[PDB]
Amino acid sequence: MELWLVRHGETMWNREGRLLGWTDLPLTAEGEAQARRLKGALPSLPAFSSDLLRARRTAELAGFSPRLYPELREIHFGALEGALWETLDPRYKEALLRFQGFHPPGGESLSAFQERVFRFLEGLKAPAVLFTHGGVVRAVLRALGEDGLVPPGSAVAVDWPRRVLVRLALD
């Protein structure tokens, strides 16, 4: 089934390189500009969005009025929320780089995160645009066997759960 996933615009923790999960930060001015650029570049499909501010706002600026689902949230980093990627302990860094065996204290395991995301995708009954997060887009792209890193404010379309259709970045 055709699904479009959008990585929300940038927040301050993107340029600062800090893990941003359930911490509810707003978009930066540039993050809002990235979101506005998506208007007219995405299909007019039903829209669903993570309830976190940065995702909701990206959807709004992109011209949508999405229904909110926390199931579309970024992974909960637990005690690692706000941690600088640069100084992350090797165990955590390798786990995130390899996207495996990640279980932050007080947070959500990568396994639980994947089950959450894929369960939500399975429940969709028709093509839709999903305003979400970097980790969600990454989980989907990786499950489809491709590199999962995409720019903030960019999108990807996939035929779930078979293949990636397109990656769309604007400037």
From TrEMBL:
Substrate binds at R7, H8, G9, E10, T11, M12, W13, N14, R54. It comes from the Bacteria. One of its GO terms (cellular component) is cytoplasm. It comes from Thermus thermophilus (strain ATCC 27634 / DSM 579 / HB8). The keyword Isomerase applies. This is Alpha-ribazole-5'-phosphate phosphatase. One of its GO terms (molecular function) is phosphatase activity. InterPro entries: His_Pase_superF_clade-1, His_PPase_superfam, PG/BPGM_mutase_AS, PGM_Phosphatase. The keyword Isomerase applies. Keywords: Glycolysis, Isomerase, Plasmid. CDD domains: HP_PGM_like.
